Design a protein around this ligand. Structure first.
Ligand SMILES: C#Cc1c(F)ccc2cc(O)cc(-c3ncc4c(N5CCC[C@@](C)(O)C5)nc(OC[C@@]56CCCN5CC(=C(F)F)C6)nc4c3F)c12
Ligand SMILES: Nc1nc2c(ncn2[C@@H]2O[C@H](COP(=O)(O)OP(=O)(O)NP(=O)(O)O)[C@@H](O)[C@H]2O)c(=O)[nH]1
Length: 168
């Protein structure tokens, strides 16, 4: 079994908890306390490899310290999540990427950009806009629905594929 330390980052309300809880418990949670940050572990097979996924679902206040720095740099891959009906969450992605790059002290950090809530009609962030920022950073882009589970497995597996590429 290969262990893979994944961190899900992004604004409040984008569905970081819904996405984690779908992969790991296979149900959609309408309300999950927005304050609650936790690690979830799941044994899964990805491309024939048995993996233990250790997923930090981030929450809480914007609050930089040496110990939050340490905690974040143990992530091997980051799922940078925005909601397709939340322009501000999309504009925040650069920030999250910059904090990842800083605590990793590196410009090549395994990462997937995730456009969540693709089930919703009110979309303010176009696929094309997201695709453009992805190709810019050199990372995969995937649209997801924690609600229907569209793209959820693919999102997390794609990240794992990214971690493999990075360590050949
Ligand atoms: C997230 C994150 C994070 C990493 F991804 C990597 C390394 C980090 C090292 C740290 O010491 C701290 C964090 C970290 N933790 C929380 C963080 C946090 N909160 C408030 C909203 C929800 C939450 C789950 O993101 C927790 N929020 C932000 O950015 C929020 C914005 C919006 C308000 C003003 N902020 C700066 C910004 C832009 F766009 F320039 C977005 N960063 C966090 C951060 F870097 C790191
Ligand atoms: N329609 C729809 N609703 C979603 C989807 N994912 C999450 N939601 C909803 O959007 C809200 C936020 O979800 P949640 O997972 O709590 O967001 P979060 O990023 O985890 N916030 P936090 O930082 O507190 O953990 C909830 O009402 C949840 O039901 C999705 O793909 N589609």
């Amino acid at each position: 079994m290969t262990e893979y330390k994944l961190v899900v980052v992004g604004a409040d309300g984008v569905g970081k908890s819904a996405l984690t809880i779908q992969l790991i418990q296979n149900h959609f949670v309408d309300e999950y306390d927005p304050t609650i940050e936790d690690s979830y572990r799941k044994q899964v097979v990805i491309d024939g490899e048995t993996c233990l996924l250790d997923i930090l679902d981030t929450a809480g206040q914007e609050e930089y310290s040496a110990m939050r720095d340490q905690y974040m740099r143990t992530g091997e891959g980051f799922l940078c999540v925005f909601a397709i009906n939340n322009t501000k969450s999309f504009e925040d992605i650069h920030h999250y990427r910059e904090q990842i790059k800083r605590v990793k002290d590196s410009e090549d950090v395994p990462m997937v950009l995730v456009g969540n809530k693709c089930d919703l009609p009110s979309r303010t962030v176009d696929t094309k806009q997201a695709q453009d920022l992805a190709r810019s950073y050199g990372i995969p882009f995937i649209e997801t629905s924690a609600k229907t589970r569209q793209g959820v497995d693919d999102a997390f597996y794609t990240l794992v594929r990214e971690i493999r590429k990075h360590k050949e």
